[PDB]
Design a protein around this ligand. Structure first.
Ligand SMILES: [Cl-]
Lengths: 243, 246
């Protein structure tokens, strides 16, 4: 029986996180803390003997830079990297760019909480003529109108991520390539919801810590055997339990 | 008669490396960029933005001084999402048993004249590594896909050309002909090999060609990938200053 190891990294604090703005597909960079966390994740992987053959990341520079920093730290900069929009963060619709506190003062704390934490209720949608509509970005020129999001719930993020796992990433894993994925909270949640068959009720409660390698050991059918976080388990638990 | 095409290919030689600063032969030794090399990569990105260049596909080597140059350029250009292909056939010329040795030390070991022959010849390679030497690339995980014939113990410019051009013909040239706007971030001798082929440059001429670091080099290629013209981007007087003082 085969065992494959898959490693996931959620990027750390972004510039817009620090500024208390909804981000979604807005393409902001990492903050100094996010940059520090990317290097920390690389150092942990190097200390623990992790070696990779192939890396995946999103089209968003906060995840791409996380991967590049990790690879530089691991002296693995020559490795093949595949970037794809299907690993993007959940799209935040017409909330993108807005201050979270002002948005809650305007529309109500509970309504914003629903937009943030519901499985299936999306934030308000963009119109295609909005400056923020992804169809205006050259990076999304290849997307059909059905693929370009105006807003996403976690449910819709799952529907977008899982085809990429099934058609592209999983075959690479089955080939024996040791894969590292650097991506985002909701797209990594989508992946682990599929792998561990997590209920809608449980997945909305799952908080993947930032800057912490998450390792899945998968059997010959890519069914999980076990998973674990790398690092100081006391510090990891604190990262998990903070919101 | 046939339909005219104009393809644009952009080449960037990486800037100063840490071992450049230390006056060491580098070759396939995988050293990083110096602070000046880091700055040059940003400057190249800025000029490409200023001059209106956008890209669809990037190639670089397995050596981090070139990869880092590409990554800095892409960050500067807000093009970090673009597909990147890295391949050892774009590596710098291998300098054999001189790698890591200081240039002044090497003049001691071998004499000024023999060193200049190895530096400036077309097909006289420097002393070769033994496979038991820690510097032999077979020891590196990154090269485990190479055959024994592919692992270099030393290279002349000729052997570098022999290694680069199959990659151009088999991989990069088809991408260019598909219409993908290609950016190549690489090294002095691997970019010499490409331009030797594109412009049909003699051995005598190609050894005198000094591509300036951090300066985008644009080739306009027609529908058959024959060059129409080429030019550097930036302040031409400053570029000539850099070329002249080298
Ligand atoms: Cl890359």
């Amino acid at each position: 029986h085969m065992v494959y190891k898959l490693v996931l990294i959620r990027h750390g604090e972004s510039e817009w996180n620090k500024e208390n703005k909804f981000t979604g597909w807005y393409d902001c960079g990492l903050s100094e803390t996010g940059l520090k966390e990317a290097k920390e994740a690389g150092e942990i992987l190097l200390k623990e003997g992790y070696e990779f053959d192939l890396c995946y990341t999103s089209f968003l520079k906060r995840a791409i830079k996380t991967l590049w920093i990790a690879l530089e730290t691991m002296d693995a900069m020559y490795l093949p990297v595949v970037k794809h929009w299907r690993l993007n963060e959940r799209h935040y619709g017409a909330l993108q760019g807005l201050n979270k506190t002002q948005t809650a003062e305007k529309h109500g704390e509970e309504q914003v909480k629903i937009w943030r934490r519901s499985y299936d209720i999306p934030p308000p949608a963009l119109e295609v003529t909005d400056e923020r509509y992804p169809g205006h970005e050259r990076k999304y020129q290849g997307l059909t109108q059905e693929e370009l999001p105006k807003t996403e719930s976690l449910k819709l993020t799952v529907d977008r991520v899982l085809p990429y796992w099934n058609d592209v990433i999983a075959p690479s894993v089955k080939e024996g390539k040791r894969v590292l994925i650097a991506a985002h909270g909701n797209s990594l949640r989508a992946l682990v919801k599929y792998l561990d068959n997590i209920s809608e009720e449980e997945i909305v409660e799952l908080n993947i810590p930032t800057g912490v390698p998450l390792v899945y050991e998968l059997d010959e059918n890519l069914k999980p055997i076990k998973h674990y976080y790398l690092g100081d388990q006391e510090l990891i638990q604190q990262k998990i339990n903070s919101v």
